[model samples]
Target: DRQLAEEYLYRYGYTRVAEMRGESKSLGPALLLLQKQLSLPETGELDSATLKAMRTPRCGVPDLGRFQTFEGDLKWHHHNITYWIQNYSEDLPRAVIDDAFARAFALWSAVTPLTFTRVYSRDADIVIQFGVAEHGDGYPFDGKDGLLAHAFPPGPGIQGDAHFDDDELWSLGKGQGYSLFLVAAHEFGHALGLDHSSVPEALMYPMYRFTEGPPLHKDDVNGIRHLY
Candidate 1:
């Protein structure tokens, strides 16, 4: 158990445990940091809640730290951003996918100086697609239920591309399927160069949740505005 705990902490940028001295080795600071981020009680000891939260489904992007932010050059230079849906999902209607993405982009544009436009022809600033298994890029989809999707920061070439897993049931209805809007909203956050947030309430929080109503949380708004 101690060995697994040490590995978990190291994997999430928590602690650098060289050797396990059983539970004797102190990891209070690391535990405290993780607890604060996940909104768990700030007890500097390993507990059931902390372990469970660690197992929760979260964004595929690695977690750096609680207050860490992406570098400046990673952000887009222009306010007017264009995106193109390179493909669609068979799980949901094409119109549903389109509407979901439109709304997802709008959520970010509403808060910042950014504006998103759907470009059918010509190369877009950002590209969206649905793929299964090894779909070309180095990071491939892990079937269903593991990695829902992933995206790159703003830049050239394959950068700023968002890919979703075709294995999962994508839908708009509440509780019926993995909310495309929610996942897209999170992925678009990454596409905009915003890293994962430690705040559980924030849309950029690593874990996938069925969020309703206005998508942008205060932390999310602040993070995007900081970049733009």
Candidate 2:
């Protein structure tokens, strides 16, 4: 549990590499920060609840952990954003993928003045890809039952591209596997320069808990409204 928890803390920015390297006694502070993010009791101890929360499925992007969205430096300079799906997932048909991504993008655009357009060509603002383990991004997918997928925060070139772990058993809405729409919506949140929200029920929350209803929580609406 010590190794796993320390790795989790280091991975999510709860602790620094120097502290994780061994000498200092900041594990309690890291655990406290994590507990704070999850709204758990800030006992500063690695309790059962904290460990379980640490293993919960979430985005691959490291938690911003109670910070502003990329410190306001990552927003797209333009209002209209273009995305290109360079490839498709093996589990789902093209139609489902299209609808899922479209709905997800529309969810964001509906609230803010920003717009998303699909492009067949490469070099779009947000290039979406589906790949398995060791995909080129340095932060690779760990097969199934781990980080679901990830996207870069808004910026130039490959900055805003989103990638999915094709190894995952994906589903539509909320069913057998992870919800494609929900995951895409969360990722597009990142694509639009939003960060991991600490609010447990918020769509932009670091943890990817499943919910069946309207996609955006009030907290999500608040974030996007403030962003765009």
Candidate 3:
């Protein structure tokens, strides 16, 4: 319940509230934040809608314990950002994975001046990998459904690496398993230094939605352009 409350606060720009309370105070502020977002009565009590939204699948990038908005200058300082597939998932064909990543990168390049190149012989700015539990990044994969994937904000070393949970039945098409393109697009938003948006329709929103195409909401575009 406390974790849910903290996550709920994080999603609604109440990080300070979550921290101030620190699992000891009442969940009233957290519940109120959700209530305001959902246009529900500010009863300050957990309701069915609040509980249901809490059950939604969100990005693994830790939001609750961090600043709500983008912190520092996390954007890549270069126009051409190179990426490398450190590894590929066994579930999907290499061709599919490659294509999916290309398309995903294209989505961001379309909106910003940034460009992405895939490298193999040497290290790249971004590293992609499919990992299972305890994949050495401190943030380990939790089996399947909980955490789909995570990416780091721009910097050095593991800063721009993205890891997908191999336990998931990653897919190319809709209606069956999580869509790789969709998840990649979202994680790449993080790679570009944008934090989760409060708008549900925005691609940078923490929760995972399987909607088709490059679902880069206007807010998403604005956030990227702000950095670049």
TM-scores for all candidates? 0.81, 0.91, 0.85
lDDT, candidate 1, equals 0.78
Better of 1 and 3 by TM-score: 3
Off by over 4 Å in 1: 1-33, 42-46, 65-72
Rank by lDDT (best first): 2, 3, 1
The worst-scoring run of ten residues by lDDT in candidate 2 lies at: 64-73
Error of 1 at 135 (Å): 2.3
Give the worst 10-residue stretch by lDDT in candidate 3: 63-72
Q: Write the per-residue lDDT of candidate 2 for residues 1-228, one digit (tens) a residue.
A: 899898888777778633554635768878887788778889989999998888888888777332223333788888889999889987889989989999999999989898899998877999999988988867788898778898888877668889988888888746588888999999999888888888888899978787888879999999988977
As for candidate 1, its clashing pairs are 58-207, 59-206
The digit string of per-residue lDDT tens for model 3 on 170-192 reads 99747678889989999988888
Question: Per-residue CA lDDT of candidate 1, range 31-144, in tens?
Answer: 776687668899987899888776665566656542234344778888888999999998888898999999999888888888999998438888998899888776666677
Against the hidden true structure, what lDDT does model 2 obtain? 0.83
Rank all candidate structures by their TM-score, best first, as comma-separated numbers. 2, 3, 1
| Residue 56, candidate 2: C-alpha displacement in angstroms | 1.0
Which residue pairs in candidate 3 have backbone atoms (N, alpha carbon, C) closer than 3 angstroms, thus clashing?
A: none
Clashes of each: 2, 0, 0
